[PDB]
Amino acid sequence: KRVLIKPLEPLMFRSQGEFEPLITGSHTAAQSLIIPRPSTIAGMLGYILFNKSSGTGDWLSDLTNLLATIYGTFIETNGEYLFPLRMGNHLALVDQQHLINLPTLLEKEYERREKGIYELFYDKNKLFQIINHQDRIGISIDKSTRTVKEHYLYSARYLAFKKEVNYVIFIDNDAISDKINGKIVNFGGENRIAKLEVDDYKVDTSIEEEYYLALSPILIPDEALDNFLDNISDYVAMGKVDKISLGFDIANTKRKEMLTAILEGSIVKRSIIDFIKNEIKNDLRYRFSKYEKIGYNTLMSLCKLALRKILS
Amino acid sequence: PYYAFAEPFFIHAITHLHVGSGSSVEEEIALPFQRDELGYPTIYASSLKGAIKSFLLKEFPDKRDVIYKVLGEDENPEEASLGTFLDAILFAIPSRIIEIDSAKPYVWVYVTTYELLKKVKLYLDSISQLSNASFSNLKNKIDTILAKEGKNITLDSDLKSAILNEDFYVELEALNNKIPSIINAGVPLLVLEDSIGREVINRSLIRVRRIRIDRDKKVVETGGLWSEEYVPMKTIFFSVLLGKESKESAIFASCILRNLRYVILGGKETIGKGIVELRWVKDVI
Amino acid sequence: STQREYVFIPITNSITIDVKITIGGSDHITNIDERGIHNVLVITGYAVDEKNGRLVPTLDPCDYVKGILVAGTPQQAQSNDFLTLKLPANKLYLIRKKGNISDDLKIYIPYSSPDARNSMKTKPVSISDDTIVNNIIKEVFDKIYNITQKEKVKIEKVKEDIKELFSYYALEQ
Amino acid sequence: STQREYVFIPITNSITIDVKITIGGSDHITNIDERGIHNVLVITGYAVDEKNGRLVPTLDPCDYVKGILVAGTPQQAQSNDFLTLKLPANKLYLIRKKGNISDDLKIYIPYSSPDARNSMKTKPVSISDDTIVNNIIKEVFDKIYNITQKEKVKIEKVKEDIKELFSYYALEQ
Amino acid sequence: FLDYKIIALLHDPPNKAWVITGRAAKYIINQLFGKNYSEKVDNADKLASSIDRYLGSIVYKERSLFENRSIFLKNILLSNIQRDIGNLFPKDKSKLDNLILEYKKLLNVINKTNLILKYQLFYLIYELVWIDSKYENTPSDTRNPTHTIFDHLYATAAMMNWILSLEKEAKGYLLGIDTIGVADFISKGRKTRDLWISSYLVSALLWYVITWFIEEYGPDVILFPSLRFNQFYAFYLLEKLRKEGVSEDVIDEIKELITKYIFNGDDLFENLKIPPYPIIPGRITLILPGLIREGEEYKKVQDDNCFISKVKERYNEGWRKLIEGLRCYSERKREDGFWNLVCRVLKLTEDLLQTTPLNIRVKQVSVTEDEIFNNNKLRSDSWKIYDNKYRQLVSEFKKSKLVKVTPESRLKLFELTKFDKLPQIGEKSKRGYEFCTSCGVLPAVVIMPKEDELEKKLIDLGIARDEKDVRSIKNMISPGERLCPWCLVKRALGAEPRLMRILLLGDLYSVEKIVNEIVSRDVKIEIPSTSDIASIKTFEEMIEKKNEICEDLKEEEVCEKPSESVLSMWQWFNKNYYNGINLTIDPEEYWFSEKRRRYYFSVFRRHRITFPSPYYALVRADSDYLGDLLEGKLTPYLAGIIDSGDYANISEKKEEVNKLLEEYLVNAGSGSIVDYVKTVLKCIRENLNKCSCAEKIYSNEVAKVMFRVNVEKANVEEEVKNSLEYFETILNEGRIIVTPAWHVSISSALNRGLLVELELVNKHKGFVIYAGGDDLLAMLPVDEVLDFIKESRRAFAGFGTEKLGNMCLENGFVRINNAYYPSLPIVGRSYSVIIAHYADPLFFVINDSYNLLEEGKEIIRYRVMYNGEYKDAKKDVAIFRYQGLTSVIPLSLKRPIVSSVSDFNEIASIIDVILELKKRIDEGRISVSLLYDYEKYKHLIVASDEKYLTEFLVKDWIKRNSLRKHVEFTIDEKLYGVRLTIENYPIKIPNDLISNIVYTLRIIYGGEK
C-alpha cells in the first residue's frame, strides 16, 4: 500500500539544468533533482514488472497496463515526513508542521509574508541537513595507451544523503506490491541502486480543502496554456511552472515528450482542479488519465496527509 | 527482481592507494582522494567497475565476451550491464597507537566510526533478502556494535585506553562480549564516536608534497610543486557486486571471480599506488 | 473605543435573532465594491451546528468556518456562553485583504458549548440552494448592509461570489 | 471506554498540582519509541494566559501550541474552567504518528478566561535555559513516565529533541 | 486638454530662490497662454511633495514666513551634507529674455500643431542648456532645501496626469511592468556576445513598450527609470527628430549638448548607430491617468483592463516586429553565409518564434475622487494615498512573485516533441531530439557536427550548401554546439546588433525602412569575448612594444594592419583599435589555442614577456535594500540592524527607527523653521500627546507676519494640529512619507550614477554588459578589480578622487560643473566578483555570481559599529570566489554608512588595505610566504581579543616574512575584532576579517596562473 524506496548510495536524477540554486564552484554540466519525477518511479516499477509480450509503440499505454494508480512521492527520514516546497526557484523540504498554517500565511501583510516564508525557506528548511550535492567527474581511458581518451570527460552532480532517507510513494494495487517487496532495483540514472520495500499503511483519500500541495507535477495540456497562464494567480498561490521533459522511454529509445508542468512542491488553490476537469476533451482526457495513473497529477492537503488525484 | 544475487567483498589496500577526484584549490592539497559525503574516503562505483573491467580484460583475454556482457560494452553501448558495483564504503582505516597500561602491546589498530558502520549495515541489510547471502554473523556483529553507539568501543577487551595517531587520547571500553574478529587480522578494531573518529581518520591519511626536478641542474622547476592524499596500506573498504540472473553472469561469478584476488585501482600506478586485495565475504566471516 | 461582533453563514436561517445592532457606527470592514464579496474572514478549528447555530471548537486545523466582523453586540443576555477577545487587528487571517487597521479591535464571537457528553465530529459542507443567501442578505446582510439592492447593479454577482467564496464544516451532531 | 486529556508543557513552573489521576488504567498515548518522544499534538488558534498560565483561545492558527495527551482525569474538580471535550481520535493531528488509534478519546485541556482588557501580543517561544527542561522532566516527563528508569533510558536526546520540538507562543504578559 | 504641462512643469522657474525674499510668477510666459491656477496647478504644487505638508500647510504657499538670505542645499536622504547656493544666479535680470531666446533656439523648426513633441523635446534639453547657464542648482523650497528645483518641476508634472484625470471627472492608475526572469535569461549564452545581447534584449524589449506611452501621453508619466539621462530616450528622441528631417546643423544644437554630458565617449549612437550600453531596468512603473489617445483628443473609459492587456500586446508586438525584421534581413543576405541558415530555420520554425523568450507581469492600481477630495479641497488623510497606492502596487508585485512562469512553459511543443514533428538541421538525433547547449531547457534545431571532418562533415549534411559558406558558419557557431530557435535568434543577433533598432523606436518607422536603411550602411561590429579581456595586458605588452618584441609575429596578422572598419561598443576597443594591432584577432586561435601554443611559449620568453592569464573577472554590483528605500523604510539607513521582517510590528524598534529619522527630519530644516520643528517633534510621548504641545511654541511662526502681510487668518489651531498629525502617522509608525519627488529624485540620482560608473568601468580595461540604476555587470582583467570596486563603491556614495567624464564627484553630491546633484551614500551596495577561466561556460559563471551575491547579501552578518556600540550588520559586502576559495570584504563598518560629512573614507577602507598590501608583496618588500604563514598566526589572532596583543601578532607575522627588515606597513586597529558571522550553509568562509584579507589576495594573485 505504501512503498519505501531506500537509496543505497547517491543518485542521479538528471535534470536539464532546470535550476541554478547553488554556489559550489563546480561547472558540472549535469545536476540532479531533489525528488524524482513520477515518470522515473513508474519506469522503475515497470522495469521490475516488465514482460516481453506487451510490446506496443506507446510507452505509457504499456506502463499503465502494468501498474495501478501511483501517488506522489516525498521524503521519510526517521519516520519524519518531509515534503517539497517551491518559491519560484527555491526548493525546501519541510514538514506539515510548517504546512498547517501555510495558507493562512500566504495572504498575510507584506512583511508578515516576507518574514514567515523566508524563515520557512532559510531556517525551517531541512534540505541541507538531508541532502549534500556531490560533484563527480569521470573520464574514459583508451586501453591501448592507458592515458585518458580525447573528448571523454564527463561530470555530474549526484544527490548524496547525509542521514538515511526514503522516498515514499503510495500504490493502489495490492497484488503487484507482493512482487515489489525486498527488490534491489536500479533506481534512477547512472546505474545507481535502491531497495524497494512495501508496507501496509494508511492514508486518507481526496479531502476537499482549499489549498493543495502539488506533490508531483501537474501537466497542462497545451490548449489551455495561454488561457491558463494568462490568469495564473487564480490557480497557483506559490510555486513555479516550467516546460519540462518527461524522460526517456527504454523500448523506443527516444526522449518521451515535453509538457508544461506545475513543478512539485507547489501550492495550488482548489480552483485548478475544476480547470483541469474542464479543458480535457475525451481524447486528451484519455492521455491525461494515463498520465495521472502513472503518478503525475498528485496533490496533498496542507492540513493532513490526504492525497488526491486532480481528475480521479 | 532483476538483481538476483549480490556478493559483498572487502578491499584491502596492499600498497598505498590514490583514487583521485577533481583537482582544485580549496582544501589545500592539490589532488585529494574521493570523499563520500561525510568526508570519508570512498571508491566510486564507476572507478571500481572501470578498474576491475580493465584488469579482467587484460588477464582473461578470451572471456572478453563474458566480461563485456556482465560489465558492459564500449563499442556497442546498446545493451546494459548485468552487474554493478556499489560505491566502496570505507570500513576500517589503520591508526597508530600508544598503549596506556594495556595487556597486549600494539603499535597500530584499525579504526572505525559509527557512520561507517551505519553505511555498512545499510548495504548488508539491503542485500540480505536474496536467499543466497546469509552471513548473519557479520550483520550480527555490526548490529551488536551499533547498539553501543556513542562510546569509543574496542573489539579487543584489553586496551582500555590509547593515544591514536600521536594526537588523540581516547578512553575505551569493551563491548561486554567477545564478538569474534570481523577482519581476520590479529589487530584490534576500534569503533569511535563520530566527532573524534573523523579527526583520527583525517589524520590517518597520508599527505605528500611532490616536486618535479630538472634533470640537468637538479633544481625544482617553476610551478612544479603539489601535494596529494593517499589512503594508507591495510585500509579496508567495503562494497557489493550486484548481478542479475543471466548465464554469462553465472559463468562470470563462477570462474572470473574465483580467481580475482589482487587488482589495480586508482591512479599513480607507476608510483606503486593502487594494488588491492579483494576479499570475498562468503568464506571469511 | 471600538467594538465588533461575529457573523457566520450556514445554509440555515439561524442568524436572524442575533444582534440588536444595524451597523454600530457608519463604517464597516468587510467591503463589497463591484467585485463580489471581499475581506471574508476564515477561522480554523470550528464546526457549525446549523440547527440552533453554534460554533463548536474542534481540533482539526482545516475545520474552517467563514465569518464577517461588524460592530455590534447581542441581546444583553449573552457573553456567558459566547467567547470574546480584543484582537490586535492582525491576528485575524482574512481573505482578499482590503481594509486596514486602527491599532486595535474588540471582538465577541458566538461560542458553542463543548457538548462534552457525545463523541463530537463534523463534516465539510459547502453552500447550496441560492435562495438561502438570497433571503439571508435580506435577513442579516441588509440588517448589516443597507446598500443592498440600492448600490450594486449585479446582485447575482454577489450571489455567485459569496457562493464560491464560502465553505465550512457542519457538525452533523 | 477510553479517555485522554491535553497537557501543555511550559517552562515556567505551573505543574506542581496539575494532575491527580495520571496512570490509573493501562496506557497513555504519548510514548517514546527508542528515538525520542512521539505523537506531540499541535493545536492551532490558541494562546496562554501565563500569569497563573492556562489556555485561552485566540483567533489564529499562527500561534501553534504543542503539547501531549495523557489518560485519566486530573483532580476531578474542574471543567468549569477547562476545555473538556471528546474527539474520535481522527480530528486531531499528532506528529510521528506510530500506529492504529482507538478512534475516540476525551481531552481535558486546561482552559482559562480571556479577560479581554489588553490585547494578546503573541510571540514565538522556543525552549531555552536547559536547566528548565532538566527540571520539567521531573515536573512532567518522569512523573508521567514510570517507564523511565525501567525501559527507555535515553534522557540525553529526549531533551535535545524538544530543545526545538516543544515550541509554542506567549503574550509577553 | 493635456500636454500643456509646460506650465505644470514650469509652475515656477529655477529662479524660485531668486524671487523669494530678496537675493536678486515674476515671469509667467512669453510663448504660451496664461498659466491657470484655481486649483489646477495648486494641486500640482501641493500634492507633489511633502514640503507643503512637512512645514505647515501655508508657508510653502506663501514662500515668506521663515525666510533667510542664505539658501542651504541638503541631500534628500541624509540632510547633513550641505551646499550653499550663494549669490551666483541665473543670468542677469536685464538679460533674462536672452535665455528665453536660448529657449527658442530649436523649438521653431517643426510644425506647432502638435504638443507631443513641442512639450517633450525640451524636457530632456531643459536641464541641459540650463546648466550651460551654470545655474548652480538651487533647491525648490528654501525653508526645506531637500529637493532641488528641477526635480520638483518634474515631480509636479508627474502627478499632473492624475490632476487631469480628476479634471475629466475621475480616474488615475499606477501601472507597473517587470520582466519575469532576467538573471535566468542572461544565463543563456556562450561567448558574451549572447550575454550582452540578451541584456540588450531585455533592455530594448522594455524600451519598445513605453515609447508608445510617451507618444500617447508624453514623458513624466513615467516614474522609473527617470527619463533624465536615459541613453535610450536620448537616441530615441534624437532619431525621431532626425526622421522629422533637419540639417545636421539643425540637430547640432542637441548632438554635442548630449555627447558632452551623456555618452561621454567617442564611438556613440552615431558610429555604432546603437547605444553601446543597455541601461533600461527590467522593471518600470507608471503613473497613468484614465485618458485614451486615438486622435485629436483624449477620451476616457472607467475600466482597469484598458491597460493590463494593452501593455502585454505591445510587449509581444515588439518581439513580432523584431522577428519579422530578422526574417527580412536574413532573406536580404542569404548570399553571404550563416544567413542562409537563419533564413532556413526561420522558415523551418515560425510558430515557436511567435512567442517571446521573456515574460512580464503587470499590476495597475486605481484612484478616484472619493477620499482624495470632498468638493474642491484636500481633506485630512489626502496627502496620504500616493504612497499608499504605491505600496498597493508593490504588494501586488511581491505577492505574485511567489510564482514563477519560465518563458518556455508557454511553448506548444507537445505534438512537436511526442512525434517527429520537430525540424532538425544536421544530424537527426538518434535519441529523438537534443537540448541546446545554451539553454539546456529547449530542443535544439541546429546541431553542429562535433568534430571529425568539420569541413566536410557538415558539407556532408547539406547545411553547408557549398564549400564557401562554411567559414561564415564555423565562425559564429562553435563546433559541437546545439542551438534552439531562441538561441539561434541570439547567435544571429550577435552576428550584428543593428537590427535592435526595430525594437528601439516603438514602431516609429516601418520595419522595412529600418532594415533597408541598414542594408545600405555596412560596417563590422565586434564584441569582446572572454578570450579577449583575458588578454588585455597581453596586448598592452604588445602595444607599447609594437614590433620591438614582435618580429616573428609580424606575419601572423596579429602584429598587422587593422583592415576595414571594425568598431566596438567596448570603449577600450575605441582607444586601441588604431594602435596598429588588430584587436579583431581571436586569441583562442594563436596562443589560447593548443597546437600553436608551445611555440609562442618559447617565443615570448626571449622577448622576456609573460604568458597571458586565462582569467577574466565577472564583476556585478547590487544596491542593498533598494526596495525598502523607494518604499520609504530605514533598512537602507540601518542595513543589518533592522530587516524587512522587523517591519511587521515596527513598534519594537522604537529606539532605532524613532531616532535616525528625527535627526534627519528635525535637521532637514534650516534658519528658524528648523526650531519650528526642533521643538514640535518629540512633544508626543515627551508631552501631552495631543495638539497642545506646539500651541505654546507655535508663536515663533507668527513672529514674522507684518511686513507685507498677505495671510488671511492667523488662528492656527489647525497647522499645529496638522503638523502634529503628519509626524504622528509617521513616528507612531516609523516609516517615511513617499512623494513623486522622492521617487523621481532617486531615479535621477540613479541615472547620474549610471553615467559615472559607465565612466568608471572603461576607465579600467572594463566591458559593461549591463549598467543599471542600482546594479552593474562587466568583465575586467584580474589586475583592475579591487581598485575598481574601491572607487565604484565610493563613487556610488558620491566621492571623487578624480573627474570622471566631466562630472565633479564631490563629498555627498555629484556636481555637474555647477549642478550639485545628490548621490546616494546612505544606500548600500554589495559586490560579487568571480575570477573565471575563459574556457568556463558562461551559464554557470553568471548563475554562481548572481546567486553568490544573491544569498551572500542575505546570509552574512558582520560585526559593525552602530551608535558607537557594536552591532551585526547584514549587507554591503564584497564577495570574491576563485573556484572554491570564497572571500568576503565588508565595506562600511558603520551604521548608517556615512553618518558624518567626512565619514566618506570609512567606505571600502579595507580594499585600501588590500591594495597597500598587494602593492608591496610583489615589489620585493614582503615575501610570498605572507599568505602561507597566516595559517600559523590565524588561530592566535582569532583567539585574541586584546587588540594590542593582536596588533603585535600581526606586526610579527608581517615582519617575519619581510625581504628587507625595515618595512613597517601596519593594519589599522579597527580591523581586528570584526567577525564575519556566516551561519548554517555549506559554503566556507573564514570567521575573521584578516583571514579574508588574506584570501582575497589568494584569489587575486591566483588569478594569474
Ligand SMILES: Nc1ncnc2c1ncn2[C@@H]1O[C@H](COP(=O)(O)OP(=O)(O)NP(=O)(O)O)[C@@H](O)[C@H]1O
Ligand atoms: N536589462 C538588464 N540586463 C541585465 N540584468 C538586468 C536587466 N534588467 C534588470 N536586470 C537585473 O536582473 C536581475 C533580476 O532581478 P529580480 O527583480 O530578482 O528579477 P529576476 O531575478 O529577473 N526574477 P524575479 O525576481 O522573479 O522578478 C536584477 O539584477 C536586475 O537588476
Ligand SMILES: Nc1ncnc2c1ncn2[C@@H]1O[C@H](COP(=O)(O)OP(=O)(O)NP(=O)(O)O)[C@@H](O)[C@H]1O
Ligand atoms: N520598487 C522598485 N522599483 C524599481 N526597481 C526596483 C524596485 N525594487 C527593486 N528594484 C530593482 O529590481 C531588483 C529588486 O530585487 P533586489 O535588488 O534583490 O531587491 P532590493 O529591494 O534591492 N533588496 P536587496 O535584497 O537588498 O537587494 C534590483 O535589481 C533593484 O535595483
Ligand SMILES: [Mn+2]
Ligand atoms: Mn525578475
Ligand SMILES: [Mn+2]
Ligand atoms: Mn537590490
Ligand SMILES: [Mn+2]
Ligand atoms: Mn534578489
Ligand SMILES: [Zn+2]
Ligand atoms: Zn538553445
